[PDB]
């Protein structure tokens, strides 16, 4: 578990009925309750101002909300799960792999390995922590109708998983428009509180554009917040592709992809608040992302 069950707040007066309203308002985790703005709670038909306090205080008991030393914070970060990309080179570039808790943006032109990396991740997020996995399910939001379950079979076997189980562990959803894409997230909160997910994939967030450009950006920004909110509330890793700034601001780790020779691909760290601006070379294989021969 990478988040505190909201049911743990049903004490000292908090009822199942109270939590029921919280869930209904979209809070399915203690962290969610802990990170919710007081105003949001108060505007919930049924929650008293004195009750909101009860909730906040209780949640704050289960979820850290105070100060700690930068030294301590460093330690905690070093404990974050980093999902393996399947490539030693790439994992090294990312200081271990895809960092859970924030958004990693995969950008570049079509056929640069972005989608392939997502297919691999959809599987490695399911494997044992001991081997760079997240022992959790994957929420896969596809806006281009390019996801292909069959590609995951070969990948699962490569990691010793039973293909049937691997495909069963991926909650797939095709989004047809921005409002739909955003609507899918609300349902994801519910699912994630019912089964352990370790990763959310959105290929690609830029579909958000298909005079009113300002409206597009405002929608894109709202979607990215929702994604980061889910990362905070459930402690999962989030990867988003971007076919080719709201993205530079929202994304934590931004990786640029270019096509290399043959099945080889290049990946450069474009933005990161802690990773050095370096680049590596990885490859694409019938059984997922790996390192060059
Ligand atoms: Cl750090
Ligand atoms: Cl490719
Ligand atoms: Cl790609």
UniProtKB/Swiss-Prot annotation:
Miscellaneous comment: Present with 6960 molecules/cell in log phase SD medium.
Protein name: DNA repair protein RAD51
Superkingdom as given in the UniProt entry: Eukaryota
Gene from which this protein is expressed: RAD51
Species annotation: Saccharomyces cerevisiae (strain ATCC 204508 / S288c) (Baker's yeast)
Subcellular location: Nucleus; Chromosome
Similarity annotation: Belongs to the RecA family. RAD51 subfamily.
Expression triggers: By X-rays.
CC annotations in GO: condensed nuclear chromosome; mitochondrial chromosome; mitochondrial matrix; nuclear chromosome
One function term, GO molecular function aspect: ATP hydrolysis activity
Quaternary structure and interacting proteins, as annotated: Part of a repair/recombination complex that includes RAD51, RAD52 and RAD54. Interacts with HED1, RDH54 and SAW1.
Listed GO biological process terms: chromosome organization involved in meiotic cell cycle; DNA recombinase assembly; DNA recombination; DNA strand invasion; double-strand break repair; double-strand break repair via homologous recombination; G2/M transition of mitotic cell cycle; heteroduplex formation
Keyword Flavoprotein: no
């Amino acid at each position: 578990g990478s988040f505190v069950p909201i049911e743990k707040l049903q004490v000292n007066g908090i009822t199942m009925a109270d939590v029921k309203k919280l869930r209904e308002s979209g809070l399915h985790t203690a962290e969610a309750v802990a990170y919710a703005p007081r105003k949001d709670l108060l505007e919930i038909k049924g929650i008293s101002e004195a009750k909101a306090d009860k909730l906040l205080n209780e949640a704050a008991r289960l979820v850290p909300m105070g100060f700690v030393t930068a030294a301590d914070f460093h330690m905690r970060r070093s404990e974050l799960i980093c999902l393996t990309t399947g490539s030693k080179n790439l994992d090294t570039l990312l200081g271990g792999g895809v960092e859970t808790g924030s958004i990693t943006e995969l950008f570049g032109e079509f056929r640069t390995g972005k989608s392939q990396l997502c297919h691999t991740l959809a599987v490695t997020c399911q494997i044992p922590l001991d081997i760079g996995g997240g022992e959790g399910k994957c929420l896969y939001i596809d806006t281009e109708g390019t996801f292909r379950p069959v590609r995951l079979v070969s990948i699962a076997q490569r990691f010793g998983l039973d293909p049937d189980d691997a495909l069963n562990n991926v909650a797939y959803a095709r989004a047809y428009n921005a409002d739909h894409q955003l609507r899918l997230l609300d349902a994801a909160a519910q699912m994630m509180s019912e089964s352990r997910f370790s990763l959310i994939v959105v290929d690609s967030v830029m579909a958000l554009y298909r005079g009113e450009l300002s409206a597009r950006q405002m929608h894109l920004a709202k979607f990215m917040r929702a994604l980061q909110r889910l990362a905070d509330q459930f402690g999962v890793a989030v990867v988003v592709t971007n076919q080719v700034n709201i993205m530079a601001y929202s994304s934590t780790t931004r990786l640029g992809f270019k096509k290399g020779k043959g099945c080889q691909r290049l990946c450069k760290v474009v933005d990161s608040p802690c990773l050095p601006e370096a680049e590596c070379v990885f490859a694409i294989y019938e059984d997922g992302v790996g390192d060059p021969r």
